[model samples]
Target: SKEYHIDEEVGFALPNPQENLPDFYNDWMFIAKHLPDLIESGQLRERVEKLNMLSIDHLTDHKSQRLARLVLGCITMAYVWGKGHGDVRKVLPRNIAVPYCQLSKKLELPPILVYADCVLANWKKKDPNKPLTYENMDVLFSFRDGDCSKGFFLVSLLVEIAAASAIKVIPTVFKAMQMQERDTLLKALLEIASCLEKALQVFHQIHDHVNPKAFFSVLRIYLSGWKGNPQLSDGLVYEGFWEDPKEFAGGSAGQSSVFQCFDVLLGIQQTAGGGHAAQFLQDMRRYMPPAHRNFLCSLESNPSVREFVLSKGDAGLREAYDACVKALVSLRSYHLQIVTKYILIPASQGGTDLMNFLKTVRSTTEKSLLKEG
Candidate 1:
């Protein structure tokens, strides 16, 4: 590469110095534009127990400890997925779903993302009596207790690195959508956006060094839900959020989103029927919380990588989709020089207030499979 100096973009990244999104979610949505009446006066756990649950002087720097774990993980994921798992009751009695699962284990996040929210993904249409193997994601990625788990394993390893880059362009984007081949589905959506910008550069190897009051009072109330007895979130009501304990966890937002499987394998149409704007792209996979949601049923029970570009033809699939869409349009201009260095002009030199949170984090990192090829 051309001559570059300085600690070539300094070291330790994982959690800190993240651009494209996570300027500590721009000072907590700059106190949300009263987010739909602050989740309808459910008293967001008294503004997440008025934030600072001892961050030693708000965890020093790295923009005030990444704005104190995104102001306690965006008010503990807006009070556990916007007021205790919807369909009514927005926290009560002992308030704020017990200190929002103790400030999401003080930002070490995962209690298997609120006990497998998607209830253990796809599993070939689940419920064939659990144990889909790897002894439960190797004890759910070794339920990080051994201190500093790389920013709690970069919040579920950025949804398994965008579900392993949509499992390497699921059989060349389903053989470029079964032979119709829009130039081999635009060269497998520019090689699945260069394998999701190389799976978001593995959050540059995380490190905020956990420990926010022993992860909000003795490890997020012993990593909430599913430790058994009465199981499957006992008598429901968003019970342990959903599924797990007996096993079968779809967790990681609405479901394992490789950018909502490149917005439903490059069709990207969201307006169809029933309420909530067709689950507004499955409620933006509940803002991944959103790095996940859209394991499009693991492209229908997995297995496929080298096959289908109509047995490789159409002049070698339009010269490999015009050389991987011109090297994915030069990595979308290196994702706009990283959205002009972490979102244009460092939101007025990081004082805060990213004008409408950089327009929904730059239209969610402006992902265009060249406007769906």
Candidate 2:
């Protein structure tokens, strides 16, 4: 009983690398080398496969996995920086900073500084942010650190990596499509990208309280570097630049507009079911693609697609799906983790309230069992 209890607790406990230094260090070094090579080679398929294997191994030993995850996250951030130059110091906080400071200290490096030499060195220098102060460091270090309740940091990392990979993949798929088909897919991808930015903004608003400027900056980088042509409008219309209510919708208007365009594609998909939009759906799916037809099929088969017009109904679900797409692109495995851990788990664990249904099930089971006996 004691052993079982220990195992159960251990299963839930987040991994701590300080308890096992050598292995953590080894894995960290491996990840640091691996990220650059994968990026340079554009070996996304292999990179994803390796990431999956690594995740499986780390499941039983989350501390090392978590530590390795952070390191890989920094590397992935570096890759994003490399592909599209952005003011990293501006976007990321100064110092090791915020909720994960102890983990930063344990590694004897500021979280951002871990990649400072590798990725940041490649960029044009700007003056550093205000110097880290002892008081601030103390406060930051004192933050209760470990895995976030929802493992949001992990989710963020995964999302970032998958998005980076999609930066490599989406264009090639587009080039191969038939001209009209390509146009349709391009539009859908843009819309998906736009929705993703909104979702990220929503997630940040709820979780991080991120400022408008910082949020807009990151969203812009994603849009500007997105594989599709910027010249083409995502098909959203507004009155004029000055009188535009559309621009007022917020944060990187182009990026947000592009995301809003996905609704158009989704609307078409609904009208066509899976058949008419099948080819275009298949092409767009290549960008961080779905695990099965179920999600796409669900969208097709569900009456709600037609019933709940985007102009009304649950905007949250629509936004959540958009975020899920971004998450899928940025962190393929981690996205899967979120689905399994949060979305599917809740749905599976009887978390969905069904009071009267439960009584019916109980009665049915009792009757069936008695008859069999």
- Superposed on all Cα atoms, model 2 deviates from the true structure by an RMSD in Å of 22.6
Error (Å) of candidate 1 at residue 115 is 10
Q: Which lDDT tens digits does candidate 1 get at residues 7-56?
A: 11210112223112244334344433243355557654456445432323
Residue-level lDDT of model 2, residues 1-373, one tens digit each, is: 1221112111111211222324525544454545435444555223332432222233344344344434543443433333234322112221112222344334333232221111211111122343211111110000012212122322232222223322332333234232325334444445445535533433332233222233233322322222222321231121111121111111111121112123322333212335423333333332211211223333344332212323334444344334434432342233333334443444453423223322332232233211123
Among all windows of ten consecutive residues in candidate 2, which has the lowest summed lDDT?
135-144
Provide the TM-score for each candidate, comma-separated: 0.29, 0.25
Lowest summed-lDDT stretch of 10 residues in model 1? 4-13
Q: What is the C-alpha lDDT of each candidate?
A: 0.37, 0.30
In model 2, the runs with Cα more than 4 Å from the true position are 1-77, 83-208, 218-226, 229-284, 298-373
Error of 1 at 152 (Å): 4.2
